[PDB]
């Protein structure tokens, strides 16, 4: 059964929402209240909404986000809003945030706009969305491809931006479309690591999967390849019995750079189920990345461009026969 | 000195933000992190940003808002996102939220869209933005008019919506442009109040101003017209010595409707510095609204259309010589 959405930003609008809901007693409503404000009156009507809707959510907004008024403003009110406004010469944002925060961008038409990579999604070129795995209408992959094509077109054409920073050296970017300056921005510093010959031990680390059905495969991989440590994925909710979990406030990239400087003679091996962090770390000194492709998973668990990016990057892809591990 | 804005939604993007900031040591940055997630890693890098930026803000987002991925998603990840997605048959929102949440609307291209009034701002017709008080370039009023013209054009033309609900009976709406059905939605029920002849006392209530420079004028008005009570504005931070403040979880409209039913013989008088709530309450039984126009304020404290709306609505405008009150 489909749902109806209601979006409100004042109390009277919530009263209007209630009237609409009551005229449609047979329909499902999710109601979102957005406000910069907090008080007893807002709570009373929001609680009524909570009681009456299938789902209700209060979405707090930073004070001063809205430059408009639901009421007719006085001169005093116009003046306050006009000088709270920071004067904005430039805005930097992820390339796909040109889609998601386009309405805010449009309120600063004279600002210079520059983008940076969203992440490894920038590495899938336009043409890849046109084959054969994205080709069957109705499918989840087709719908994905259609969404991405539409998003990149918006990012590349609206709210013109004149430079794009990429953190990926030597892989073509979806934003490299000749309408902006491409600038490589090395995120990580490797000079001054002072890394030497690998005459010390070997330290093996598995990059944990945020996907809970990968738990047994992960444990099997650790046993099979003798991997002592796991770097848990930020969005991972489980542990790997018989593997030591690394606990650190750093992202894996910074953690490894810190370890290299501390242990300039240690061989570091990073094993991964095609994690995007691999693509940033392949060029670190004394670091050796291996992608694991478990035989029990379908060929299409990963999108085809993933296999190609890993190979273009010089990262070995290892068949892992996980059913041969107890 | 103008500022630069940075918008981030991942940790690696915050690292990119830091690099950009460090290359511009002489410039001012405000950085916004938007995330659905919370953890120690996000905090570490956000705290670095806090340390390095002039201003930094974490803007929490509801889980599942973003249908895209900064990384290349697996089949499992595509599946999870595809079925968290509520199927949406219709979206109701304030007319100007068609501008502010346009990017979200665009992700539901087959949903039926209906709007309702933002508030009294709907009562200023297109033509009013074209005269003479909005006419001098560079001014705050010109910039306001330009913004509103642009916003209403977007609301009226993009993401077509087929009906608009107004709570204002007998005042023309900016959205009544022949491209949608106008529907009057009476917010308040007045039958069943069972209000009778005004044979009881008179209760006078001043609607408080959210503007702190109105404190003395408000106190003067209360003394001058013998107003016993003030209904504080939701966004009002001060009190009126010698006036009883009403304390209620209801908006003034509901509060008065409750009082009328309880006291069907009482004359209620509402005094206001052109508050928009007056426009909803003029038609309540046993309620008499008076707008107060203090002589000490400039003629242009209120926008010209305000005076006209109050008169079209049958609301007396009373000159208040506030300098004649001690
Ligand atoms: C405190 C501050 C705002 C000065 C700090 C500043 C400038 C750094 C800042 C912090 C955080 C920011 O977040 C970016 C976007 O966040 C998404 C919020 O969805 C908005 C929902 O609105 C509902 C209320 O609609 C009222 C009607 O409006 C109509 C006019 O709208 C014009 C479009 O502007 C709306 C902003 O668009 C939001 C998303 O792009 C943006 C800017
Ligand atoms: C839990 C739930 C989401 C399922 C509930 C649901 C559906 C009722 C709901 C609750 C609350 C809602 O708020 C509406 C808008 O709020 C403003 C948030 O500014 C967004 C900032 O994004 C930064 C991350 O960009 C990542 C890149 O993306 C690119 C693709 O974007 C396509 C455009 O979609 C973005 C949504 O646009 C937001 C404002 O319109 C909307 C919907």
Curated annotation (Swiss-Prot), chains A, B:
Effect in UniProt of substituting residue 235 to A: Decreases both the binding affinity for the donor substrate and the rate of sialic acid transfer
How would you describe this protein's topology in the membrane? Peripheral membrane protein
Query: What's in the keyword line of the UniProt record?
Result: Cell outer membrane, Glycosyltransferase, Lipopolysaccharide biosynthesis, Membrane, Transferase
Q: Where along this sequence does the record place binding of CMP-N-acetyl-beta-neuraminate?
A: 208, 231-235, 252-253, 275-276
The EC designation for this entry is 2.4.3.6
What the record says about family reads:
Belongs to the glycosyltransferase 52 family.
Tell me how this protein assembles: Homodimer.
Report the protein name in the record: N-acetyllactosaminide alpha-2,3-sialyltransferase
Q: Which gene is transcribed and translated to give this protein?
A: lst
